[PDB]
Every structure is written in structure tokens, then in C-alpha cells.
Design an enzyme around this catalytic site. Structure first.
Site, PDB file in Angstrom:
ATOM      1  N   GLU A 121       0.804  -1.217   0.000  1.00 57.98           N
ATOM      2  CA  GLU A 121       0.000   0.000   0.000  1.00 57.98           C
ATOM      3  C   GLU A 121       0.839   1.271   0.000  1.00 57.98           C
ATOM      4  OE1 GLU A 121      -3.287   0.044  -0.922  1.00 57.98           O
ATOM      5  OE2 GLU A 121      -4.179  -0.466   1.016  1.00 57.98           O
ATOM      6  N   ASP A 130      -5.346  12.528   2.073  1.00 58.31           N
ATOM      7  CA  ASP A 130      -5.850  11.429   1.262  1.00 58.31           C
ATOM      8  C   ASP A 130      -6.527  11.999   0.016  1.00 58.31           C
ATOM      9  OD1 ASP A 130      -8.005  12.543   2.520  1.00 58.31           O
ATOM     10  OD2 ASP A 130      -8.641  10.714   3.553  1.00 58.31           O
TER      11      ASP A 130
END
Ligand SMILES: CCCCCCCC/C=C\CCCCCCCC(=O)OC[C@H](O)CO
Ligand SMILES: CCCCCCCC/C=C\CCCCCCCC(=O)O
Ligand SMILES: CCCCCCCC/C=C\CCCCCCCC(=O)O
Ligand SMILES: CCCCCCCC/C=C\CCCCCCCC(=O)O
Ligand SMILES: CCCCCCCC/C=C\CCCCCCCC(=O)O
Ligand SMILES: CCCCCCCC/C=C\CCCCCCCC(=O)O
Ligand SMILES: CN1CC(=O)N=C1NC(=O)Nc1cccc(Cl)c1
Length: 414
Positions: A121, A130
Site C-alpha cells: 500500500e 488522502d
């Protein structure tokens, strides 16, 4: 004679003796079961040497009532202070080494999942945002939803414990990652489609399932209805073939190939990724309590109270002769409860950790309630007899009785 006080109208000494005898009997029965069936998977999985030290403490716990309820001899005042101090220390300090190993094993299980997603990830050691503008750090660990950058560094310091200035380390991003895994497992257990498959898989293959949840979400992993059914039936080769046809495989093939390979072998090959030491540490932790008892023998020598003519044996034990070994035993209880609660969901050895955590919950309440009950009582001998026997019975009934039941009553389960 305890029978003399019974017919005289006082059934306390005779009751404490029967309590101790039944405890000695049950402790004798439990120990022989573990000696005979020593080579069975249920007994071979846990620490066998540490159990004998716990059972020996419980045994000496019931024996304490035979020096508390005894004839006026001098060594019994010595054996009182030596048993009421050591017999809990023997059980609790052997149990703290058992719970400490269970926590380090659990912490090492989270080290291999953290390295799994650090490679799959990604990982950032400073604050970012984000895809929707929420301040984030580490492996997608959300800090806050406030537009204030100062608000993110506030929560970050409160989560790490130091002034980070917005920058963390790999070990600090792992601390935040363990919280995201605990939240992810709870979401999987709260999901009707992923809960059965998660229970059947081993520790390694559970990480591969969590890896998919972190990439696609719980509702996205639930779409692999056929493959999840294959993984539950332990048809690994069929599951890998079926997963290699998915749109998830063709969009991120470099990552999907490693998760699929983990489902296959059940190992960590797709990623780069003591017994005698427990007896010595337990032995050291017992000698410390004994050193306290011997030191108090030199400061406050034992002596029979009064120059009398009785079932009850009154010694000259002061508060310091009681509190000092009591406090050390309490520290052993706090450490046991800390690691027992930390591993309360570890399912190894037929959910052995669930029964240990419940034992420390009751032990804390029993020992906490003892302090005001005992030091405010005018029947200290009998209240001490029942307290030691009750605390010994809790550890014997919650930790060992369930393991003896599976041996004798469920031979096929074991
Ligand atoms: C561990 C061993 C502790 C000593 C054993 C014992 O019984 O000591 C009593 C002493 O002799 C009383 O004067
Ligand atoms: C059932 C298990 C019974 C075991 C012990 C109970 C016996 C209690 C006797 C106490 C008095 C002994 C005596 O003074 O003779
Ligand atoms: C069964 C084995 C022992 C049961 C009898 C125990 C008697 C304890 C005597 C203590 C006392 O007399 O004060
Ligand atoms: C092992 C040691 C346990 C008990 C032995 C006692 C050691 C201290 C000597 C006696 C102290 C005293 O009565 O003054
Ligand atoms: C948080 C869980 C705690 C469980 C263990 C508690 C054990 C208590 C042990 C020691 C506390 C000692 C307090 C003694 C106060 C002095 C009594 C007196 O002399 O009157
Ligand atoms: C859920 C029930 C928990 C009970 C909590 C009891 C807490 C007591 C622990 C420590 C208090 C020690 C203070 C000194 C005790 C003296 C008592 C007395 O003299 O009567
Ligand atoms: C002094 N006090 C107050 C209290 O509440 N308990 C004790 N002592 C004790 O429990 N010793 C023991 C003995 C064998 C096994 C086990 Cl688990 C514990």
C-alpha cells in the site's frame, strides 16, 4: 480441634478446613490429569512447566489455612508469612511470564502484516492528505477531518506521545497501523459475508484477506463470493485460479499476485518480510518475594501473640509484614492483567487466553476488596483463610477446569 469449636457454636474453623481439603483434592485431581495426558494437543500447546508452578502455588494456598488454623507452635508463624506471601507469588509470577510471551507473540504477528502493507500500500513518514483532503500519515492512518493542519499535529502528538512536528518514524507509523487493523478486524467480524471465511483461515491467510479489505473495502471483498467460498473450504489452488480472472487482478497485477500467492502457500514467500528462559524469569520473580519475606523476618521476628492456653493461632505479624508482600503480589497481578487483556482475543490453545483474562478480572476485584475488608475486620484469621482459598479457587476453576473438561469429556475435539 476445629470440631470442638463447631459444637461450641463457631463453625468458621471447621468450614475453612473443609474448603482447603476440597481445594487440595481438586488441585490433586487437576495435576494428575495434566501428568497423565501430558502428550495431548491441549496440554502440549501451553507451557507445561509453568502450569506445575501455578498448581504448586494454588496447592500451598490451600495449605495456608493449616498454619492459620493450627496449634500454637513457633514455626507456624513462620510458615504463615512464608505461605501467604509466596504461594500467590508462585502462581502470579509464573502466569506473568506466560502472559508476557503471549503478548510478544501477538506483537510479532502485527510487525508481519505491517511489513505486508508497507510494501503493497505504501507509507509516508510525514503528514499528507488522502484523496478527499483529510489529513493523514503513515499507511493511510487518518488523523483528523478538520481543515486545520495544526489540528492534525495535535492529534498526532496525542497518538504518539511526543512533539513530532508532523514527522513520525516507521515504528510510530506501525503503532498507528495496529489501530487500523483492529478497526478492520472488527468491521470484518461485523460483516455476515466475511466473518465465516475469516474464522477458518490461519494467521497468515487472515492478513491476505485484510490486505484486500484495505485496498478495496469490506463491500468490495464481499464481491468475491465464489473465491471466498473456496478459501473457506481450504481449496487454495482453486481460489488462486479464480482470483487471477478478476478485474482486481488485471488492474493491479503486481499487488494482486502477492496477495494471491499468500492465499496459495499460506506463507510470506511473496514478500521480503525461550522455554528455559521462562522458568528462570519466574524463579527470579519468586526469589524477590522471598527476599522481602526473609528481610521482614529480620526486622519483625515472628512470635506467638500473648502467653495463652486454642484453635486460632495469633502471631505478631504487623501491617508491614502483610502489606509489603501483598503489594508485591499486587504488582504481579497488575502485570498479569495488562498482558492478559492485551491478548484476550488470541484464540490459540482452545481460546486459552479468554479464560486467563477473566481470571485476572476477578482476581483484581477480589484483591482490591480484600484491603478494606481485612484491615477493618476483627476476624482477620478467618477472613485471611477464605481470601487465600477463594483467590486460589478462582485461578484453579477458571484456567484449569475448562482444560480438564476438554480432555476427559471431549476426547475427539482434542
Ligand atoms: C523457600 C523455602 C523457605 C523456607 C522453608 C521453611 O520452612 O522455613 C521455615 C523456617 O525454618 C522457620 O524458622
Ligand atoms: C469430601 C472431602 C472431605 C475432606 C475433608 C473433610 C474432613 C474434615 C475433618 C476436619 C477435622 C479432622 C479431625 O480433627 O479429625
Ligand atoms: C483429609 C486431610 C486432612 C483433614 C483434616 C485437617 C485437620 C486440620 C487440623 C488443624 C487444627 O487442628 O487446627
Ligand atoms: C529461606 C529462608 C526462609 C526462612 C528462614 C529465615 C531466615 C532468616 C533467619 C530468621 C530471622 C529471625 O527470626 O530473626
Ligand atoms: C488495579 C488492580 C489492583 C489489584 C491488586 C490490589 C492489591 C492491593 C495490594 C496492596 C495495597 C496495600 C494497601 C495497604 C494500606 C494500608 C493498610 C493498613 O495498614 O491499614
Ligand atoms: C468493584 C469493587 C472494588 C473495591 C475497591 C476497593 C478499593 C480498596 C483498595 C485500596 C484502599 C486502601 C486504603 C486503606 C484501606 C484501609 C481500610 C480500612 O482501614 O478499613
Ligand atoms: C493476602 N491475600 C488477600 C487475597 O485476597 N488473596 C491473598 N493471598 C492469595 O490469594 N494467595 C494465593 C495462593 C494460591 C493461589 C493463588 Cl491464585 C493465590
Amino acid at each position: 480441634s476445629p470440631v470442638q469449636y463447631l459444637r461450641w457454636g463457631d463453625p468458621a474453623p471447621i468450614a475453612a478446613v473443609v474448603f482447603a481439603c476440597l481445594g487440595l483434592l481438586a488441585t490433586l485431581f487437576v495435576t494428575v490429569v495434566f501428568i497423565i495426558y501430558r502428550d495431548t494437543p491441549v496440554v502440549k500447546s501451553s507451557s507445561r512447566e509453568l502450569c506445575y508452578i501455578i498448581l504448586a502455588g494454588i496447592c500451598l494456598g490451600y495449605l495456608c489455612t493449616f498454619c492459620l488454623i493450627a496449634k500454637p507452635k513457633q514455626i507456624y508463624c513462620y510458615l504463615q508469612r512464608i505461605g501467604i506471601g509466596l504461594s500467590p507469588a508462585m502462581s502470579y509470577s509464573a502466569l506473568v511470564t506466560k502472559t508476557y510471551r503471549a503478548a510478544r507473540i501477538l506483537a510479532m504477528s502485527k510487525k508481519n502484516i505491517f511489513e505486508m502493507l508497507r510494501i503493497d500500500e505504501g507509507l509516508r513518514l510525514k503528514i499528507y492528505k488522502d484523496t478527499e483532503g483529510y489529513y493523514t500519515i503513515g499507511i493511510g492512518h487518518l488523523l483528523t477531518k478538520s481543515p486545520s493542519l495544526n489540528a492534525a499535529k495535535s492529534e498526532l502528538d496525542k497518538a504518539i506521545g511526543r512533539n513530532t512536528n508532523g514527522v513520525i518514524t516507521k515504528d510510530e507509523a506501525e503503532k498507528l497501523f495496529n489501530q487500523d487493523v483492529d478497526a478492520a478486524v472488527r468491521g470484518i467480524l461485523r460483516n455476515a459475508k466475511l466473518k465465516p471465511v475469516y474464522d477458518s483461515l490461519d494467521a497468515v491467510r487472515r492478513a491476505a484477506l485484510i490486505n484486500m479489505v484495505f485496498q478495496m473495502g469490506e463491500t468490495g471483498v464481499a464481491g468475491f463470493t465464489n473465491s471466498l467460498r473456496m478459501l473457506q473450504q481450504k481449496r487454495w489452488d482453486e481460489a488462486a485460479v479464480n482470483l487471477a480472472k478478476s478485474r482486481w487482478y488485471n488492474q493491479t497485477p503486481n499487488r494482486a499476485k502477492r496477495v494471491i500467492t499468500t492465499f496459495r502457500t499460506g506463507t510470506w514467500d511473496a514478500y521480503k518480510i525461550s522455554a528455559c528462559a521462562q522458568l528462570v524469569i519466574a524463579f527470579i520473580l519468586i526469589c524477590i518475594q522471598l527476599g522481602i519475606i526473609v528481610a521482614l523476618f529480620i526486622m519483625e521476628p515472628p512470635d506467638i501473640m500473648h502467653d495463652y492456653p486454642e484453635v486460632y493461632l495469633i502471631c505478631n505479624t504487623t501491617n508491614l509484614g502483610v502489606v509489603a508482600p501483598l503489594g508485591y503480589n499486587g504488582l504481579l497481578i497488575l502485570a498479569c492483567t495488562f498482558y492478559a487483556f492485551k491478548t484476550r482475543n488470541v484464540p490459540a490453545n482452545f481460546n486459552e487466553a479468554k479464560y486467563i483474562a477473566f481470571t485476572m478480572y476477578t482476581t483484581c476485584i477480589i484483591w482490591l476488596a480484600f484491603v478494606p475488608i481485612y484491615f477493618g475486620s476483627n476476624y482477620k484469621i478467618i477472613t485471611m483463610c477464605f481470601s487465600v482459598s477463594l483467590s486460589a479457587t478462582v485461578a484453579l476453576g477458571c484456567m484449569f477446569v475448562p482444560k480438564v473438561y476438554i480432555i476427559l469429556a471431549k476426547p475427539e475435539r482434542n
